[PDB]
Amino acid sequence: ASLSLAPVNIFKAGADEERAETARLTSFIGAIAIGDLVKSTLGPKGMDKILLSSGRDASLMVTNDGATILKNIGVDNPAAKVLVDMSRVQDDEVGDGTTSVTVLAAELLREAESLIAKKIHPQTIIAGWREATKAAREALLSSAVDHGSDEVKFRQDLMNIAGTTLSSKLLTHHKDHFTKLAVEAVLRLKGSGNLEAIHIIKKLGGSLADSYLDEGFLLDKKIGVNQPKRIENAKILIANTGMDTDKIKIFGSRVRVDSTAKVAEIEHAEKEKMKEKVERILKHGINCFINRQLIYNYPEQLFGAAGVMAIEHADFAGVERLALVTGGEIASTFDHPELVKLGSCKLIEEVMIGEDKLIHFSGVALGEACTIVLRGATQQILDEAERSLHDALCVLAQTVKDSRTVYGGGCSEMLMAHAVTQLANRTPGKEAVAMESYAKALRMLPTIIADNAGYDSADLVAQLRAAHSEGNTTAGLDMREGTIGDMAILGITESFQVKRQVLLSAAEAAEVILRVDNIIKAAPR
Amino acid sequence: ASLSLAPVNIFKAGADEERAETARLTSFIGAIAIGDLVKSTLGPKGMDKILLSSGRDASLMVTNDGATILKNIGVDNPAAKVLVDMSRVQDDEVGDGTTSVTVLAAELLREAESLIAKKIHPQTIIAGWREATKAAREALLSSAVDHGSDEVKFRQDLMNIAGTTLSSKLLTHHKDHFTKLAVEAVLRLKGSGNLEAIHIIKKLGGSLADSYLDEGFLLDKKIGVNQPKRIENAKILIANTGMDTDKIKIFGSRVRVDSTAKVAEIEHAEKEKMKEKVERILKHGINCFINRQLIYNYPEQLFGAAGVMAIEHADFAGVERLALVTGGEIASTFDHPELVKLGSCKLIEEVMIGEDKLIHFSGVALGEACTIVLRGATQQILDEAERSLHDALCVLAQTVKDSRTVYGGGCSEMLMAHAVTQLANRTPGKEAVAMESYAKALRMLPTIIADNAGYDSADLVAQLRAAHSEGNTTAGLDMREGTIGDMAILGITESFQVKRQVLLSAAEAAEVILRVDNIIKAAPRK
Amino acid sequence: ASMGTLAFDEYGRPFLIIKDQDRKSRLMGLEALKSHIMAAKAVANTMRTSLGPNGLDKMMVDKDGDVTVTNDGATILSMMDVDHQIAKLMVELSKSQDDEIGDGTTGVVVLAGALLEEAEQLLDRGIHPIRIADGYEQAARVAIEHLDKISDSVLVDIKDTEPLIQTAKTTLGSKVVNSCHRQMAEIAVNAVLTVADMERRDVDFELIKVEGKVGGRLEDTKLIKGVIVDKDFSHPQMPKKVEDAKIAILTCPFEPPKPKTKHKLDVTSVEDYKALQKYEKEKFEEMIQQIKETGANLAICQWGFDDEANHLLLQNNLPAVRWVGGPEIELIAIATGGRIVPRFSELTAEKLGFAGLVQEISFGTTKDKMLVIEQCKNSRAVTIFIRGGNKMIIEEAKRSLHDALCVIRNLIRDNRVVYGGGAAEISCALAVSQEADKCPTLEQYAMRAFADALEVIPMALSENSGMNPIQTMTEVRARQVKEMNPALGIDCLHKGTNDMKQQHVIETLIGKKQQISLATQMVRMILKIDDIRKPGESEE
Amino acid sequence: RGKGAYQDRDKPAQIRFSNISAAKAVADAIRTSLGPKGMDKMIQDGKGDVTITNDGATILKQMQVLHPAARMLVELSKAQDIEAGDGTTSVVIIAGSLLDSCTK
């Protein structure tokens, strides 16, 4: 029975239950709504999107990646919340394919709606989809190719993959140069899998071509007054002390005086203690000093008299990457000047770019940190460029970890679709119908990928289907003229692990969402 | 340059026209609504539908045929009006298949909006649908069969076709008796298409199995007071004479007298003229008189003195059919007894069924009429019975006019499916995709056909596909077992002409609907 | 029995009976019982769809906006906006069945639903609830006797778990995790047998936590015989991997403890200030030397440490973590065999737990790592790590492993088991029909009511999948007449055979008898209650 | 073998349940006046017309109801009265009970 047509509604105010078909209608309609809201960023012609803040903040951002929309969007449909959860999972896994897995899930749900309207049970659909996913995964691994051993081929595949990632973004104008720059940046880590080490800056104005890579480090903390402005070839030490009005941590201590003479004596004692601490710091043999918290007037005056620069407002990430790139060691007790390693740098300077004073590091010792200069007229294009660069770094790291790759741009999509169609016509029953709907969603993904360019779909899809039937498993759609051809020679390749992860995530999300039959609601607040 | 975002517009009070894509959305959702309201009445497991007008009148209809269902319904989508029009055209052409063509058009528009979502243009859709309709018509022509030359084969085909037609109706229990009755009535008409020659009574009480095609007739008029209650072997006289408050048509004459003696003499004049008129009536040698208008006390008293039956309030259609079947004539001047034709009758009596008195007629001369007694439990089950009988008579008459037949019940449907499937596989382009969606809707019609009983769809589709692959143009579904069978052996037979008309009309209506892009609305009157 | 009572006294004066009677719907008696039974009707019909492997999964959005997609009925209905006390009573019924067995919680609810289904028609016939309850109790005794008669038991002990693996796979088939049923069964049995007591004692579920992180693939779900630590090392250059580590239990911050009562210290002169500074410095020195005296590898701080302590630990190269939750401290102390340490006074190398292996785990570009502890020679805690494509499949895996482990615990408790999937239900229906045929007539209506009530389980199983229910019902009943077997039932997975035993489906007999008894008792109690008070003021 | 037809559409079923509910409302409003041991009906007209009797079909003619099922039950009762003349009250009660059975 259903509570929709019942003598009583056992609910509080605002809580309701709806008929099974209506419940799935609402859930899957919310899911497909979020799906086509994230849609239209597929392919190299993906249109950008503004991430506006409805509140008084009014923070306006633009991005071509749909995951940014997913992380910052209001949630109404519970299935939409499930979709954003799985998409965030995929994004934390790999930096590309998040919008791909989201749109695949949205389609799978909309043809699930259509197929249930076609009088098919959800369990049969789930079984057919599981069979089709197994077939698609086996086909994808059959055509998967790894070329990590060959260093020249590995570098060429890195070129292709970074170009693939940047094609969907607006940076396609300098795609090749930014590609070689990012590949050099990722190889600068000497096989290190971390990505927070690579740091980026923002500078208003200038052409996009002005963007480049800095091998050293870029710093944007001001220098003191009395200390000399520029001293090179110094030793840099990182400290975790407050370095401001240092007082006894004992809570119960208090001062009880009968006259101002003892007050002045205590003030002089505090000044002498601060001077002793300053001398203890200077005992380390340091000229460029780095601090986290504030530095007051007396210590900065003492540093200026000592001719030693103190750098404040160095946050945890900044000191982290500075230690990674120079080998400096963080310290909190300065009673052992020789027991803490000091940072080694070749050249330090305070460059003047734009209308700001930026400290630039050159000749870093360890080199385990990359600093990238990005130039843009507006902050929006700047953040879009940095997000695209970060996604490129993520996909490059994923390729470095495993070099198993496949031919994308609809090519491997046609492989999967062909395998699933072959199995569907091989098998009888409504499971075949469900998994053929799976296959048609698979085919319609690159359909809209290409149609985002205002091109034709059916002719190219049929041509690629026929060519891959002939055995042209390396044939893929070319965005340059909206035509077909050898996908590899276009220099556009996709990692096999990313494709497999996207396929599995979409399959599992569709399976878990489809099993929902009825929606029950508690009392809203 | 559209109205999606424009600072200024041109509209009247309450007027807001709507763009092409949302025009397609609204028209197609209206078409879907029409199809849904006409569907679920297909196949032997069809389910009846009730009507209830939104006003306080609440017009209530019970019928298994979708044509009457769509006859009485509020219309707001003009495409819905197009659908109602084409269904009514099919109904005026033949009796059966109107719901079939309506649901075909509805599902075609469904697949049309699906293709629109699939990013295709309507013109290519229309071209592909024309090509697919051509191919389907060719395939239907391939397996057409006619057996009208042999009278016994023709009667067997009539038996099968009427049984198939009445299976989708509620009378499936007595299908055999009803089919025999329909065959008897059709062959009693001598092949004439005069539907007005057929009348069926709606009387309350009894069981539907008791229904029979009596050779005579029934009169619902009342016997006079002084008139005899039983006259046998009389002569049927039908008149247009008013003979009530009889006055000259000249309205320019009035009575301006100076004495009541003049008025009394005038009244004596009208009573004498009434006596002369009664004498003129009686001199024709009559015993049963039929009149359209009312009868006063003096004429009935004189007739009772004269021993002549009088029948009043018999409408023009009934008396005309009585003259056609018997031999009487309608008259207005009684100075020509020899120039007025009279019929021949054998049995006129009264029958009491339940608690109502009916004047029973029997012994026809020509027999060019069909009257069937119906023992309906309620008024609505009666209405369903007459609707089903009329549909059976219409389809039998159409088969008489054109005796070409085919095997349907999904078998022919899968035949068109196979033909369009090969056509799609043998050509490239979006045209092939559009006509494949065409064929998919064609196959989706048997989905409703079989799901009116809760049977499997895909398994039977594949089974019939294989059967037609071996060439079995007779392999169709059977509601008894849900398997394949020989429609010729199983008796499920359909008229070739009716099916071809249904297919062509559905294709034409779909083409007409797809050619409209924008719908503009003026200021609403409400 | 609506909007109060209309009397207006009897000489024309205004009349008052009950407070707020202008709109009070006064509910006592047979109509009140109708209201309660129909509310239970709604609850049961909304809940029953989660029965059987083909049974679908309900979702709920709580008052806090958190979704929950679930297959196990107990947790499906455990968070319902219950208003009438009968629904709450059914909730405690489900809870009692769940903590008594763990599986079959759906069975009691559906059985009670069908019992009330025919009870309401029996009430409409004009039958007072007392005789209905007595007949229902007689019927429950008959059903329990049949269940005892058709029992069959096998070996369950720790040495052999192949039947346990089959039972776990059968139980998890109803859950979406049925893709890798063998893998989850094996890992679950390994987890439960990692630490367990076989002398009819409880297994420490405090030490067995089902926790995992999103990401990866479902088949990556693997068992970690150890402890999972969320926190990470504070220093960048600090080493991330330590082997053969020793756990230093610490329950005090790395700062000089302060007096509990309010205190005042008078610092007046330069000498006082310098003396306080050097006292505090020597206190840090004493604390750091005391910490280093034990020589432990890993130090776990509940209250954390400051920057100076962090640098001192860095120079000493002694791995340590900060701000760890108390229950986690208890778990790690039990697993490593550590001892309670209040402060540096009782800090020594002889009270340190041992961790076999400690590692930092990375899941790609997240900047959020975790600490895994395993390989302990005396590990008293074992945890199962589950991977999934999203957090809600993770939750579903959590509850699926929970139910599987509960089934394993029930099997360990006793080997008295039976065959489910409606076959035993059909046998019970046959027994109740026999009792109706062989017992006084007046209560035979309650007899056959209880029979039709027990008949709903195959009803729901069939209509969940989609096969024709009643033809299968009659055919299986006829075959069971031909041969007595609790293994002739519905082939939900469409395996083509009605031999339920051949399909390797095992459920505990204690669970089924408790299900029947609990359902009968709850139905009898609800039959005898006809009082609920409502104000019904229809506030605006 | 296994599953058959999914049977996705369900709303007309519950609409038919509503029709049966109306039919039973009329039926149990009619039921009481059967037999010498029986007691007259319990039905008041919305307009206000009043009749008082023990023969059922008179009450059937009392009601001016909306649902077509009730109207055709009235037709059934009057048809039975026309045909035989006795048991008309029984017919309506049987019809309502059968409708509830169809529900179940």
Ligand SMILES: Nc1ncnc2c1ncn2[C@@H]1O[C@H](COP(=O)(O)OP(=O)(O)O)[C@@H](O)[C@H]1O
């Ligand atoms: N040159 C190309 N030709 C065809 N398809 C491409 C090309 N470059 C990228 N793509 C595809 O477009 C998709 C869009 O990628 P992007 O928007 O960066 O993230 P997501 O993959 O999550 O959508 C990629 O998944 C990729 O498969």
Ligand SMILES: Nc1ncnc2c1ncn2[C@@H]1O[C@H](COP(=O)(O)OP(=O)(O)O)[C@@H](O)[C@H]1O
């Ligand atoms: N025994 C049968 N087996 C299969 N199909 C049938 C059978 N009887 C009728 N049909 C089909 O059901 C359809 C419905 O017929 P009916 O409702 O009488 O008129 P309409 O075709 O206008 O709806 C018919 O077109 C006919 O082809």
Ligand SMILES: Nc1ncnc2c1ncn2[C@@H]1O[C@H](COP(=O)(O)OP(=O)(O)O)[C@@H](O)[C@H]1O
């Ligand atoms: N393979 C199977 N075939 C038929 N019935 C099954 C099968 N597996 C389990 N069942 C039945 O389905 C019922 C529901 O089990 P499940 O949903 O796993 O937990 P719960 O019993 O708590 O609802 C069980 O009582 C069992 O008898």
Ligand SMILES: Nc1ncnc2c1ncn2[C@@H]1O[C@H](COP(=O)(O)OP(=O)(O)O)[C@@H](O)[C@H]1O
């Ligand atoms: N004296 C009697 N004793 C027992 N039953 C009676 C008696 N008289 C009538 N009945 C019962 O009353 C029922 C209905 O009869 P009645 O009310 O006259 O017809 P209706 O219901 O059409 O008005 C019959 O079935 C008959 O068995």
